[PDB]
């Protein structure tokens, strides 16, 4: 019956300073961890998650059904052609349990000109009025600067694990031009729960959101008490523990090109559980126009034959797939 999946706890402090040395005994770490079941917990992360977890749930609890329909993407306001990415993602009682708020770079705003230009997956966030959510922008954007802070320095992780020098990944992910996103998960507690809401997995496992790879370089996800994840292996699914205090990471697609699948991007899905809690991924995503040339650690030359992808095609390509795959979140 299902097993468990390793998940070392790494302690990540040691990133954000100058011992070089220390770096690389969690580089090490990483390494490992991506080569076995590719995730790992960052502790030591120094991110108020009780903060995060509250402010959400405050969030969440409060938003009314007009001011979703307010901040709905187009999916589900077809008055917001504009919104594909950012916005209110809503629930569907008796059908789809789920919802969720998600937000970009704050930085994108009318005078960025790649919202100027119109490029895909660019677009200026939305929020509730800021007198009926006192504090929720604020809060969220500063959270998208933290959490942005703690995964350059996993970035960094990355690279020494690599084999490269630190910035190898970090010097694509900047605050001007990430196209990272944060994604304010609710799960509910329902009673009864409808089971149009459940999928069933081909082993039978009740599902909310069948197998998939990420779309991303990396993941860092929080993610309340419940335990719900589980990652493929070749001896099947194996149950990751929750750890409410820790940052969940896994590599996502991109990783997985360019290094010739040696970081590969874990398959991962959600079981069905009747509990209210939350899952808040930051999305680390790269620029629009950034290029990492791939290559193969396990190659005495490091050649790969894989092609060089911009990264702003890959993501818009992967997002629009994972809906058709996974269903319209
Ligand atoms: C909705 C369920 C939930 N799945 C997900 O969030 C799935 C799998 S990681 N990911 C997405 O849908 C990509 C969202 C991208 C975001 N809108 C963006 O524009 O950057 C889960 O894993 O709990
Ligand atoms: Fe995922």
């Given at each position: 019956?299902?097993?468990?999946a390793?998940?070392?706890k ?7 300073g100058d011992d ?7 580089a090490?770490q ?11 917990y ?6 108020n998650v ?6 959400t ?6 938003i009314?059904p007009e001011?979703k329909?307010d901040?709905?993407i187009?999916?589900?306001?077809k ?5 594909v990415?950012?916005?209110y993602?809503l629930?569907?009682?008796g059908?789809?349990a789920?919802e969720?708020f998600?937000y ?16 895909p997956?660019?677009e ?5 009025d ?7 922008q604020?809060?969220?954007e500063q959270?998208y600067?933290?959490?942005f802070?703690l995964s350059s ?8 694990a690599?084999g490269?020098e ?9 605050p001007?031009?990430?196209?990272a996103?944060v ?6 507690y329902?009673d009864?729960?409808?089971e149009?809401a459940?999928?069933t ?5 009740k ?13 860092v996800?929080?993610?309340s ?8 292996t ?5 149950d990751?523990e929750?750890?409410?205090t820790?940052y969940?990471?896994?590599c996502?697609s991109?990783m997985?090109?360019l ?6 991007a874990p398959i991962?899905?959600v ?6 809690r939350?899952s808040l991924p930051?999305?680390?995503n790269?620029g629009?126009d950034?290029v990492i ?7 005495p030359?490091g ?6 992808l911009?990264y702003?095609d890959?993501?818009?390509?992967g997002?629009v797939?994972l809906?058709?795959?996974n269903g319209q979140?």
């Amino acid at each position: 019956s299902v097993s468990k999946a390793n998940v070392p706890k790494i302690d990540v402090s040691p990133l954000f300073g100058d011992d070089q040395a220390a770096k690389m005994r969690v580089a090490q770490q990483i390494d490992a961890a991506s080569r076995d079941t590719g995730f790992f917990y960052a502790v030591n992360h120094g991110i108020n998650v009780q903060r995060l977890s509250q402010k959400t749930k405050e969030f969440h609890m409060s938003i009314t059904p007009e001011e979703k329909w307010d901040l709905a993407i187009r999916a589900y306001n077809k008055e917001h052609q504009d919104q594909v990415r950012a916005g209110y993602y809503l629930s569907i009682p008796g059908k789809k349990a789920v919802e969720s708020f998600c937000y970009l770079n704050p930085n994108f705003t009318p005078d960025h000109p790649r919202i100027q230009a119109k490029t895909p997956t660019h677009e200026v966030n939305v929020w509730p009025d800021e007198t009926k959510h006192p504090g929720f922008q604020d809060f969220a954007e500063q959270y998208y600067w933290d959490v942005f802070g703690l995964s350059s320095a996993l970035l960094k992780g990355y690279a020494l694990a690599l084999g490269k020098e630190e910035n190898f990944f970090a010097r694509h992910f900047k605050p001007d031009d990430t196209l990272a996103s944060v994604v304010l998960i609710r799960y509910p507690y329902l009673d009864p729960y409808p089971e149009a809401a459940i999928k069933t997995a081909a082993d039978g496992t009740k599902l909310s959101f069948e197998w998939h790879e990420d779309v991303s370089l990396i993941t860092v996800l929080y993610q309340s008490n419940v335990q719900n994840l589980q990652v493929e292996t070749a001896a099947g699914y194996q149950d990751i523990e929750a750890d409410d205090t820790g940052y969940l990471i896994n590599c996502g697609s991109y990783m997985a090109h360019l290094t010739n699948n040696y970081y590969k991007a874990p398959i991962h899905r959600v079981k069905w559980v009747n509990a209210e809690r939350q899952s808040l991924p930051f999305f680390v995503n790269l620029g629009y126009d950034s290029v990492i040339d791939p290559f193969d650690p396990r190659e005495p030359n490091g050649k790969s034959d894989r092609e060089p992808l911009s990264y702003g095609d890959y993501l818009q390509n992967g997002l629009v797939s994972l809906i058709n795959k996974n269903g319209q979140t």
